[PDB]
Design a protein around this ligand. Structure first.
Ligand SMILES: OC[C@@H]1O[C@@H](OC[C@@H]2O[C@@H](OC[C@@H]3O[C@@H](OC[C@@H]4O[C@@H](OC[C@@H]5O[C@@H](O)[C@H](O)[C@H]5O)[C@H](O)[C@H]4O)[C@H](O)[C@H]3O)[C@H](O)[C@H]2O)[C@H](O)[C@H]1O
Ligand code: CA
Length: 415
């Protein structure tokens, strides 16, 4: 009788996994049929934005935590608090508090108050290294607790950069980090950030930010511990990591399934190299599972969100399928201690969540346009055509204008 539209995004292993778990949901609730709208991670924001613009909102949908307040003011997200409290068995007090709290809003500040969504996951972005490669090269393994310094990291990367098949051409490299997803840690580790403590002032022209940005680009251009610009163009560094060509690459729990399938070398997790603070940094992502404020079936919609987010059986199926770590803290802890589930240092994911992971800057602002502008024109720095110093001076006023507008519009839209 009842039909739900569930809209989400995922890499192909993620799509497959959630589609399976939705079938499990439907077997459990035979009167609820779930129509799926799924996209690649890159297509999602535009599609969700179109749906919201036309006020044709999916019953259940993935959404960015940074848009919680905007969604609440625009009446996009149903207040699901009472459905979640009335639900049989579930106790989201078991769920990561940092995850649950991202989708609470008391009318004024995020983090407390009524539920406008449930955490899909927490997504600590760990650093992986190719253990097979280290061992074939006789290089001492990275320490599982003590971060490399930046200097040490380049030193090891250089050792790993070599022509291994002896044809005269480099065919193996220290790393090849994607600035979109790996610049944060270097910036943060160096005691910088995109914006100030108040989250209202762009601070990318901070010397510490610049040093981190230049350091990042220099991996490719100056230190040359990555494939060349042309080589990464031919085959991107994620793919080259999969094929065993790179010493170092990040690992999210959502990668685990794809890696199970494609990676044949032994790899493990370590802290990110630490800058001037000496403490490692990286991000802990999250997605919200929200229900349309206008859904015709709030109870069943929340039931699907709950099943994906907090239900032991639903959660178990997702963890089994290697697309996330458990949302239940105690389950995650026993998960991490299980030696038969690789990577050996799974615990690093948890350590990121508890000790040294941060939020994306955009989680603190009303929208993320100011931040998207930073990355929109970053590539010339990344390719050594423009210095980090010259770009951030150019970008800052553009970013700041956009931040100001997001601040103004949060004033307006919440009146
Ligand atoms: O140029 C070649 C590129 O390489 C290939 O991508 C490799 C993938 O990219 C990296 O992962 C980045 C990102 O993560 C995946 O989504 C996971 C979800 O995001 C997490 O939360 C993240 C953020 O937090 C919130 O502020 C906001 O909502 C999110 O933006 C959440 O915990 C997870 O559920 C997504 O697929 C990917 O883009 C990894 O290295 C690897 O997976 C591509 O072919 C190409 O882009
Ligand atoms: Ca070679």
């Amino acid at each position: 009788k009842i039909e739900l539209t569930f809209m989400f995004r995922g890499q192909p292993q993620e799509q497959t996994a959630y589609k399976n778990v939705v079938k499990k949901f439907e077997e459990k609730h035979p009167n609820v049929k779930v129509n799926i709208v799924v996209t690649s991670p890159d297509q999602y924001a535009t599609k969700l934005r179109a749906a919201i613009a036309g006020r044709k909102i999916p019953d259940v949908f993935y959404f960015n935590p940074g848009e919680l307040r905007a969604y609440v003011n625009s009446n996009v997200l149903l207040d699901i608090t009472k459905y979640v409290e009335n639900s049989k068995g579930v106790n989201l007090q078991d769920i990561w508090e940092k995850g649950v709290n991202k989708y609470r809003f008391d009318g004024e500040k995020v983090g407390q108050g009524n539920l406008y969504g449930l955490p899909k996951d927490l997504g600590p972005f760990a650093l992986g290294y190719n253990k097979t490669m280290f061992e074939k090269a006789g290089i001492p393994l990275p320490d599982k607790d003590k971060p490399y310094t930046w200097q040490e990291f380049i030193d090891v990367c250089k050792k790993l950069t070599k022509d291994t098949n002896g044809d005269g051409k480099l065919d193996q490299w220290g790393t090849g980090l994607n600035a979109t997803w790996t610049l944060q840690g270097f910036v943060w580790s160096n005691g910088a950030d995109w914006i100030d403590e108040s989250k209202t002032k762009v601070t990318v022209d901070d010397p510490k930010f610049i040093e981190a940005l230049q350091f990042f680009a220099d991996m490719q251009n100056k230190y040359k511990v990555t494939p060349s610009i042309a080589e990464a163009q031919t085959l991107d560094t994620y793919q080259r990591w999969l094929r065993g060509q790179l010493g170092f690459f990040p690992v999210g729990p959502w990668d685990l399934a794809a890696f199970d399938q494609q990676i044949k070398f032994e790899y493990d997790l370590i802290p990110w190299p630490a800058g001037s603070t000496g403490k490692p940094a990286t991000w802990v992502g999250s997605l919200g599972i929200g229900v349309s404020s206008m859904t015709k079936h709030p109870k069943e919609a929340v039931e699907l969100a709950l099943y994906l987010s907090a239900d032991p059986e639903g959660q178990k199926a997702l963890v089994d399928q290697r697309v996330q770590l458990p949302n239940s803290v105690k389950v995650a802890e026993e998960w991490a201690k299980d030696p038969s589930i690789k990577p050996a240092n799974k615990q690093e994911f948890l350590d990121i969540i508890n000790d040294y992971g941060h939020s994306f800057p955009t989680e603190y602002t009303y929208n993320g346009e100011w931040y998207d502008e930073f990355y929109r024109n970053l590539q010339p720095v990344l390719d050594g055509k423009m210095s980090a110093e010259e770009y951030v001076k150019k970008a800052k006023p553009k970013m700041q204008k956009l931040l100001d507008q997001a601040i103004e519009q949060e004033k307006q839209a919440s009146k």
